[PDB]
Scaffold this motif. Structure first.
Motif, PDB file in Angstrom:
ATOM      1  N   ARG A  61       2.625  -6.206  -1.538  1.00 38.00           N
ATOM      2  CA  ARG A  61       3.255  -5.860  -2.807  1.00 38.00           C
ATOM      3  C   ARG A  61       2.532  -6.404  -4.020  1.00 38.00           C
ATOM      4  NH1 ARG A  61       8.640  -7.124  -5.121  1.00 38.00           N
ATOM      5  NH2 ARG A  61       7.519  -7.463  -7.106  1.00 38.00           N
ATOM      6  N   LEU A  62       2.710  -5.704  -5.139  1.00 34.41           N
ATOM      7  CA  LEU A  62       2.118  -6.094  -6.412  1.00 34.41           C
ATOM      8  C   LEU A  62       2.983  -7.165  -7.059  1.00 34.41           C
ATOM      9  CD1 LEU A  62       0.934  -2.766  -8.031  1.00 34.41           C
ATOM     10  CD2 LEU A  62      -0.356  -4.454  -6.693  1.00 34.41           C
ATOM     11  N   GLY A  91      20.966 -17.048  -9.917  1.00 32.34           N
ATOM     12  CA  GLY A  91      19.846 -17.970 -10.019  1.00 32.34           C
ATOM     13  C   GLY A  91      18.662 -17.668  -9.108  1.00 32.34           C
ATOM     14  N   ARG A  92      18.824 -16.685  -8.219  1.00 29.83           N
ATOM     15  CA  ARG A  92      17.762 -16.280  -7.283  1.00 29.83           C
ATOM     16  C   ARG A  92      16.604 -15.660  -8.050  1.00 29.83           C
ATOM     17  NH1 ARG A  92      21.353 -12.410  -5.858  1.00 29.83           N
ATOM     18  NH2 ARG A  92      23.315 -13.201  -5.005  1.00 29.83           N
ATOM     19  N   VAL A  93      15.384 -15.955  -7.617  1.00 28.78           N
ATOM     20  CA  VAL A  93      14.214 -15.423  -8.280  1.00 28.78           C
ATOM     21  C   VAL A  93      13.936 -13.953  -7.964  1.00 28.78           C
ATOM     22  CG1 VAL A  93      11.743 -15.683  -8.644  1.00 28.78           C
ATOM     23  CG2 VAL A  93      13.190 -17.689  -8.339  1.00 28.78           C
ATOM     24  N   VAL A  94      13.871 -13.141  -9.013  1.00 31.82           N
ATOM     25  CA  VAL A  94      13.554 -11.725  -8.886  1.00 31.82           C
ATOM     26  C   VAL A  94      12.112 -11.601  -9.386  1.00 31.82           C
ATOM     27  CG1 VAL A  94      13.981  -9.404  -9.775  1.00 31.82           C
ATOM     28  CG2 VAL A  94      15.887 -10.852  -9.220  1.00 31.82           C
ATOM     29  N   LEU A  95      11.247 -11.046  -8.551  1.00 32.40           N
ATOM     30  CA  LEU A  95       9.852 -10.887  -8.925  1.00 32.40           C
ATOM     31  C   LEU A  95       9.614  -9.794  -9.955  1.00 32.40           C
ATOM     32  CD1 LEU A  95       8.148 -11.138  -5.444  1.00 32.40           C
ATOM     33  CD2 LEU A  95       7.903 -12.782  -7.333  1.00 32.40           C
ATOM     34  N   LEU A  96       8.609  -9.996 -10.801  1.00 34.57           N
ATOM     35  CA  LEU A  96       8.244  -8.982 -11.779  1.00 34.57           C
ATOM     36  C   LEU A  96       7.133  -8.159 -11.124  1.00 34.57           C
ATOM     37  CD1 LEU A  96       7.863 -10.670 -15.261  1.00 34.57           C
ATOM     38  CD2 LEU A  96       9.935  -9.870 -14.198  1.00 34.57           C
ATOM     39  N   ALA A  97       6.988  -6.913 -11.559  1.00 32.82           N
ATOM     40  CA  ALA A  97       5.952  -6.054 -11.019  1.00 32.82           C
ATOM     41  C   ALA A  97       5.712  -4.863 -11.932  1.00 32.82           C
ATOM     42  CB  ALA A  97       6.344  -5.580  -9.625  1.00 32.82           C
TER      43      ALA A  97
ATOM     44  N   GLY B  85       3.003  -4.856 -20.526  1.00 38.19           N
ATOM     45  CA  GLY B  85       2.541  -3.832 -19.613  1.00 38.19           C
ATOM     46  C   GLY B  85       1.165  -4.168 -19.073  1.00 38.19           C
ATOM     47  N   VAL B  86       0.646  -3.285 -18.236  1.00 39.46           N
ATOM     48  CA  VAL B  86      -0.653  -3.487 -17.621  1.00 39.46           C
ATOM     49  C   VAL B  86      -1.291  -2.091 -17.499  1.00 39.46           C
ATOM     50  CG1 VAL B  86       0.003  -3.210 -15.170  1.00 39.46           C
ATOM     51  CG2 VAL B  86      -1.707  -4.930 -15.840  1.00 39.46           C
ATOM     52  N   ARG B  92      -4.005   3.720 -19.268  1.00 39.96           N
ATOM     53  CA  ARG B  92      -2.656   3.929 -19.784  1.00 39.96           C
ATOM     54  C   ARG B  92      -1.751   2.737 -19.447  1.00 39.96           C
ATOM     55  NH1 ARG B  92      -1.597   9.734 -17.080  1.00 39.96           N
ATOM     56  NH2 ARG B  92      -1.914   8.363 -15.261  1.00 39.96           N
ATOM     57  N   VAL B  93      -0.859   2.409 -20.375  1.00 39.58           N
ATOM     58  CA  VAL B  93       0.061   1.290 -20.209  1.00 39.58           C
ATOM     59  C   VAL B  93       1.179   1.522 -19.193  1.00 39.58           C
ATOM     60  CG1 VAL B  93       1.758  -0.178 -21.368  1.00 39.58           C
ATOM     61  CG2 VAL B  93      -0.363   0.469 -22.551  1.00 39.58           C
ATOM     62  N   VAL B  94       1.281   0.615 -18.227  1.00 37.25           N
ATOM     63  CA  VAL B  94       2.329   0.676 -17.217  1.00 37.25           C
ATOM     64  C   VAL B  94       3.212  -0.535 -17.484  1.00 37.25           C
ATOM     65  CG1 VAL B  94       2.880   0.325 -14.777  1.00 37.25           C
ATOM     66  CG2 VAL B  94       1.040   1.895 -15.444  1.00 37.25           C
ATOM     67  N   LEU B  95       4.489  -0.285 -17.731  1.00 37.49           N
ATOM     68  CA  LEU B  95       5.421  -1.357 -18.026  1.00 37.49           C
ATOM     69  C   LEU B  95       5.689  -2.291 -16.853  1.00 37.49           C
ATOM     70  CD1 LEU B  95       8.183   0.487 -20.076  1.00 37.49           C
ATOM     71  CD2 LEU B  95       6.419  -1.028 -20.970  1.00 37.49           C
ATOM     72  N   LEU B  96       5.958  -3.554 -17.170  1.00 36.51           N
ATOM     73  CA  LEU B  96       6.299  -4.530 -16.150  1.00 36.51           C
ATOM     74  C   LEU B  96       7.818  -4.498 -16.105  1.00 36.51           C
ATOM     75  CD1 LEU B  96       4.163  -7.700 -16.952  1.00 36.51           C
ATOM     76  CD2 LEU B  96       3.563  -5.730 -15.531  1.00 36.51           C
ATOM     77  N   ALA B  97       8.388  -4.888 -14.969  1.00 34.84           N
ATOM     78  CA  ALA B  97       9.836  -4.899 -14.822  1.00 34.84           C
ATOM     79  C   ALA B  97      10.295  -5.771 -13.661  1.00 34.84           C
ATOM     80  CB  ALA B  97      10.334  -3.482 -14.619  1.00 34.84           C
TER      81      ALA B  97
END
Lengths: 109, 109
Positions: A61-62, A91-97, B85-86, B92-97
């Protein structure tokens, strides 16, 4: 000293987890991760993302990491980069991607 | 000055876009965004994410922003926070989430 300067100095990149294993040695529940950051190559990280994620889920995963911080040891394991996350209500860590697949090593802006 | 301190000074939060509109006054294609950052309230932002995203898609979407940098004017529009974003292969810009929903205003770590 300036939040604009800190933004300029801090280097955030997109990487992909290639290996995730239980960080048994650490007192704080975590995973030993090996992250492919493209041009930056492989960088290790100890992430406390055991709640919500299984090592099997992480592999492939990214992830987005703070790369230019000083590396530090965690229960013997050297953590060279920081995998970014945000806590949910519990409080659980949610990853960004990134919304979708993108080149590794890509810099966040 | 120290990437570690830049890390500590920079304030990254998750917000939800509640309004998106064409920033036609701006030279470089962008959208005028209104982001709900929970405890931080509403913050504006001009984001060059017109390729890959339509205003309708952005509305109600979780985004991650650099909040404590100084506000800047863009074609008269006050951009108070940066939506992160990345770039994809085409630049092109891809948003982080976040992987899933989390409390708004939550801090990235």
């Amino acid at each position: 000293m300036t939040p604009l300067e800190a933004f300029q100095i801090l280097d955030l990149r997109v990487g992909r987890v290639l290996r995730a294993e239980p960080h048994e040695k650490a007192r704080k529940p975590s995973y030993k991760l090996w992250v492919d950051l493209g041009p930056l190559g492989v960088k290790q990280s100890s992430a406390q993302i055991t709640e919500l994620y299984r090592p099997e889920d992480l592999v492939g995963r990214l992830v987005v990491c703070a790369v230019n911080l000083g590396a530090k040891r965690v229960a013997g394991f050297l953590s060279e980069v920081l995998v970014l996350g945000v806590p949910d209500e519990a409080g659980r860590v949610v990853l960004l991607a990134p919304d979708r697949e993108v080149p590794l090593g890509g810099k966040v802006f």
